[PDB]
Amino acid sequence: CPLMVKVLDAVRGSPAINVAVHVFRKAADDTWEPFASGKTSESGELHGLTTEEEFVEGIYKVEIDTKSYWKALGISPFHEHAEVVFTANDSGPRRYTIAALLSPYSYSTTAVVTNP
Amino acid sequence: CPLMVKVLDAVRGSPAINVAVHVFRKAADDTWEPFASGKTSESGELHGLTTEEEFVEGIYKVEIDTKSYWKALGISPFHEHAEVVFTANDSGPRRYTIAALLSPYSYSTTAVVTN
Amino acid sequence: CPLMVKVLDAVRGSPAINVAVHVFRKAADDTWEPFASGKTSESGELHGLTTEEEFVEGIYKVEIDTKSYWKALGISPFHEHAEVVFTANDSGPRRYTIAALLSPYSYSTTAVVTN
Amino acid sequence: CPLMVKVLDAVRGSPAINVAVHVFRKAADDTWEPFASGKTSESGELHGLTTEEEFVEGIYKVEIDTKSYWKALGISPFHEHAEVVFTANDSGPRRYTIAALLSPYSYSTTAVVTNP
Numbered sequence: 191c192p193l194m195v196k197v198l199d200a201v202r203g204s205p206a207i208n209v210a211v212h213v214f215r216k217a218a219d220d221t222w223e224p225f226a227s228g229k230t231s232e233s234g235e236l237h238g239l240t241t242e243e244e245f246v247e248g249i250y251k252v253e254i255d256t257k258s259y260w261k262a263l264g265i266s267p268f269h270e271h272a273e274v275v276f277t278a279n280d281s282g283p284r285r286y287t288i289a290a291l292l293s294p295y296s297y298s299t300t301a302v303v304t305n306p
Numbered sequence: 307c308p309l310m311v312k313v314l315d316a317v318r319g320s321p322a323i324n325v326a327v328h329v330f331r332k333a334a335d336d337t338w339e340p341f342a343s344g345k346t347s348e349s350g351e352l353h354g355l356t357t358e359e360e361f362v363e364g365i366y367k368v369e370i371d372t373k374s375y376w377k378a379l380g381i382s383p384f385h386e387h388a389e390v391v392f393t394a395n396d397s398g399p400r401r402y403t404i405a406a407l408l409s410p411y412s413y414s415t416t417a418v419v420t421n
Numbered sequence: 422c423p424l425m426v427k428v429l430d431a432v433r434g435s436p437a438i439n440v441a442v443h444v445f446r447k448a449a450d451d452t453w454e455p456f457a458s459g460k461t462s463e464s465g466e467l468h469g470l471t472t473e474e475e476f477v478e479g480i481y482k483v484e485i486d487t488k489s490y491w492k493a494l495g496i497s498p499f500h501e502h503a504e505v506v507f508t509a510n511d512s513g514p515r516r517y518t519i520a521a522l523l524s525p526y527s528y529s530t531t532a533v534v535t536n
Numbered sequence: 537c538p539l540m541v542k543v544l545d546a547v548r549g550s551p552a553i554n555v556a557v558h559v560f561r562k563a564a565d566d567t568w569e570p571f572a573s574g575k576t577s578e579s580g581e582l583h584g585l586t587t588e589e590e591f592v593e594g595i596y597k598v599e600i601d602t603k604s605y606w607k608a609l610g611i612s613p614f615h616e617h618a619e620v621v622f623t624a625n626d627s628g629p630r631r632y633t634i635a636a637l638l639s640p641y642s643y644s645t646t647a648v649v650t651n652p
């Protein structure tokens with residue numbers, strides 16, 4: 191798994207389950223092209239977004255749909271979503287974990303980048 | 307001052323000074339149009355971005371140029387920038403502070419919304 | 422004001438008001454002796470804890486009563502309190518702001534140390 | 537594993553490896569008694585601190601030695617350590633993950649609490 195997303199809920203102390211995630215990749219014309227999407231599992235994890243072959247060098251945006259997550263719990267949150275934008279694989283293939291910790295008016299995000 | 311942005315450095319324990327910040331408002335065609343911008347002060351703060359009259363309900367994006375900040379310090383960072391996207395809502399008098407706490411591979415952001 | 426404490430609420434997007442805060446200084450016997458305390462203001466801030474003369478180098482603990490804050494809101498929290506333990510060091514004129522951003526099962530804290 | 541600790545490094549974008557962790561439990565006389573200790577692995581995880589039988593109801597403190605971690609990397613950090621204090625198992629047995637994300641002048645901590 192070259193790219194994994196993990197989402198946690200800071201209000202409930204739980205994984206954030208069924209969170210929609212959309213990944214885009216910047217194209218040659220500077221537009222964002224759809225690249226992959228999915229939703230988090232019962233463990234707050236989203237695996238299988240892409241493959242080693244498909245995950246080439248580029249600028250990627252990981253959009254986490256936090257607003258829909260909170261609304262389903264009856265909370266009206268501040269943000270529309272949480273976006274994570276980064277250059278990937280420009281020094282060769284790496285494994286990326288994008289983690290986010292969510293609250294209704296705040297979020298934290300970090301990356302764990304490893305060389306296989 | 308209906309909108310203020312505050313940026314802090316989690317590595318050095320200081321305000322993040324001279325950081326470029328751009329604010330955009332979502333247009334009817336779903337495109338991001340420039341709304342306001344500036345550079346954070348010595349206290350890591352950016353004031354005077356807009357006025358009560360101009361800051362109507364809508365979807366706004368605050369883009370913080372974190373990459374340039376870390377590069378200026380010789381530190382290789384993860385993110386191209388930090389983006390904060392939110393809806394402004396009229397529900398009594400509201401002032402919005404968007405705060406961001408920066409590290410090379412991580413950031414936190416919160417909103418402090420007061421009367 | 423060599424030491425200020427600022428507490429924010431990540432659930433409601435507001436200052437955390439009327440939060441009890443206790444500051445301790447580590448004694449020679451390795452026990453925590455009370456140093457200063459108060460309750461955060463309407464802006465989530467606690468000023469006037471100490472003076473330049475009293476705030477000497479040493480190890481300090483700031484304890485924030487997060488549990489009472491969440492209980493007052495009907496929310497069951499994880500932590501008994503939030504504790505921030507640090508050394509004050511003389512290295513030119515320093516002012517310390519200890520900030521904390523609170524959620525029911527999580528908190529972030531940072532130090533803003535300036536001249 | 538009723539109690540696990542996970543530590544991440546926000547400067548390097550990596551697990552925080554070889555971080556010392558000490559767990560204490562409040563005794564009847566209100567003193568902190570040593571309960572368990574260990575250090576994080578190459579994945580930033582610390583498993584096997586305790587057992588279901590030993591991890592009874594109580595108030596626990598998890599002390600993460602962040603200062604020693606940073607000093608070994610040549611950084612002089614702000615905090616002495618990061619402390620996490622919580623009541624455990626007072627509504628019956630739960631599984632606890634205590635996570636922390638570290639920077640030299642800041643840290644974030646969250647808990648993931650699950651019912652097996």
Ligand SMILES: OB(O)c1ccc(/C=C/c2cc(O)cc(O)c2)cc1
Nearest residue numbers: 289291298299300635637644645646
């Ligand atoms: O079970 B796991 O593999 C696991 C469990 C918890 C985390 C938490 C990460 C995290 C991210 C943040 O942005 C802030 C924070 O305090 C913690 C990661 C992996």
Ligand SMILES: OB(O)c1ccc(/C=C/c2cc(O)cc(O)c2)cc1
Nearest residue numbers: 405407414415416520522529530531
């Ligand atoms: O105008 B002020 O006096 C002010 C306003 C907001 C902050 C926010 C701090 C903060 C701390 C964290 O640990 C995490 C985070 O996202 C933000 C600080 C000072």
